[PDB]
């Protein structure tokens, strides 16, 4: 098992005409494998949809992925933006 | 386009870690 | 490191024969010297003065030379042409 593989490759043809959005060298980086898309970094380790207690076939279409991400209320953020200045 | 072997970009791990950024230390004329 | 030695520069004969310094010994900002200006403790700033890198480039290394009730003062003239 080696560590020093390249995994980043550049085609010699300069196609930098419509390429202002991708990841450039500063040429285009062409990796060996695809990317990883992660939804949220912080998990909600409580929240009994995930905790599964052992008391008492049901579905629940929860609104989006933002239930499991620990977001603060706008009341405190306004209380903190008043604490800003 | 499938005969277009690309250029590998080598990291050279010692260059990744601590390279800084000699006449300017004036003891060598 | 990064320290200049205290000796080993005697660029004086070149200034004896520099023909701009008014020395009668031999014949054949806006300051010149930073003796009123600081340099923010970087020794490269003294190379911007023209009479100082003149002593760093045209300089030499010397070895140090090593060695009555009423004075009678007699002025002695020395006039020798030499090459």
């Amino acid at each position: 098992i080696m560590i020093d593989a390249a995994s980043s490759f550049v085609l010699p043809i300069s196609i930098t005409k419509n390429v202002d959005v991708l990841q450039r060298t500063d040429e285009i980086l062409w990796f060996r494998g695809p990317s990883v898309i992660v939804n949220e970094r912080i998990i909600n380790s409580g929240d009994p949809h995930l905790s599964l207690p052992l008391n008492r076939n049901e579905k629940e279409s929860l609104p989006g992925p933002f239930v499991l991400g620990l977001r603060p209320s706008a009341k405190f953020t306004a209380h903190r933006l008043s604490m800003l200045r | 386009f499938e005969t277009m072997v690309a250029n590998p970009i080598k990291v050279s791990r010692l260059q990744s870690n601590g390279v800084l950024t000699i006449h300017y230390s004036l003891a060598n004329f | 490191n990064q320290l200049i030695p205290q000796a080993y520069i005697s660029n004086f004969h070149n200034r004896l024969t520099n023909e701009d310094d008014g020395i009668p010994i031999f014949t054949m900002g806006n300051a010149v010297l930073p003796d009123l200006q600081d340099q923010h403790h970087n020794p490269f700033n003294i190379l911007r003065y023209p009479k100082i890198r003149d002593t760093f480039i045209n300089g030499k290394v010397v070895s140090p030379y090593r060695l009555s009730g009423e004075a009678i003062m007699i002025p002695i003239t020395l006039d020798i042409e030499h090459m």
Side-chain angles (χ1 to χ4, degrees), chain A, chain B residues 1-20 22-29, chain C:
Chain A
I1 306 182
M2 307 182 46
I3 320 185
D4 204 269
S7 88
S8 293
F9 293 84
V10 161
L11 302 175
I13 298 183
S14 278
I15 45 180
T16 77
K17 295 177 185 55
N18 299 328
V19 194
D20 206 77
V21 175
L22 271 175
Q23 182 182 14
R24 296 189 275 111
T25 67
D26 293 339
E27 305 156 289
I28 310 179
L29 278 167
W30 302 102
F31 301 94
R32 201 162 42 205
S35 45
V36 181
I37 303 181
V38 290
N39 279 331
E40 280 179 341
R41 297 303 178 108
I42 303 186
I43 197 56
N44 205 332
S45 61
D47 277 9
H49 302 267
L50 309 180
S51 91
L52 201 147
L54 301 176
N55 295 328
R56 307 164 186 176
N57 287 310
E58 296 179 353
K59 303 194 175 184
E60 182 148 348
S61 279
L62 85 166
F66 54 88
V67 171
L68 301 176
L70 279 76
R71 303 296 193 255
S73 88
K75 179 154 180 211
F76 170 64
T77 312
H79 180 264
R80 204 57 195 281
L81 275 165
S82 46
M83 274 158 86
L84 182 135
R85 175 176 295 181
Chain B
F1 189 76
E2 321 199 324
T3 170
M4 203 165 297
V5 285
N7 302 321
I9 303 187
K10 286 181 290 299
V11 178
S12 52
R13 180 199 286 264
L14 186 144
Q15 283 182 353
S16 166
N17 207 26
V19 187
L20 305 171
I22 303 183
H23 191 269
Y24 288 157
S25 86
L26 273 74
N28 42 2
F29 277 91
Chain C
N1 293 328
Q2 70 174 357
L3 281 181
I4 317 178
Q6 191 58 254
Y8 321 111
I9 285 187
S10 287
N11 198 44
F12 175 59
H13 59 88
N14 293 323
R15 289 168 318 167
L16 285 168
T17 60
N18 215 17
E19 304 181 346
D20 54 353
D21 290 331
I23 292 186
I25 298 294
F26 282 135
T27 307
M28 288 290 119
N30 295 322
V32 185
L33 304 158
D35 305 337
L36 287 180
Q37 306 169 350
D38 55 336
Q39 284 180 16
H40 306 286
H41 309 269
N42 286 127
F44 192 74
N45 301 336
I46 208 168
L47 287 188
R48 84 166 59 88
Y49 299 94
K51 294 305 183 50
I52 291 168
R53 68 177 183 177
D54 165 77
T55 51
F56 279 122
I57 294 306
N58 314 112
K60 65 174 295 290
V61 168
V62 84
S63 177
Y65 40 80
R66 294 159 185 182
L67 275 83
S68 171
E70 179 59 46
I72 299 181
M73 295 317 186
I74 302 180
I76 297 307
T77 61
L78 179 67
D79 195 3
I80 292 183
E81 51 93 22
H82 192 251
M83 327 177 281

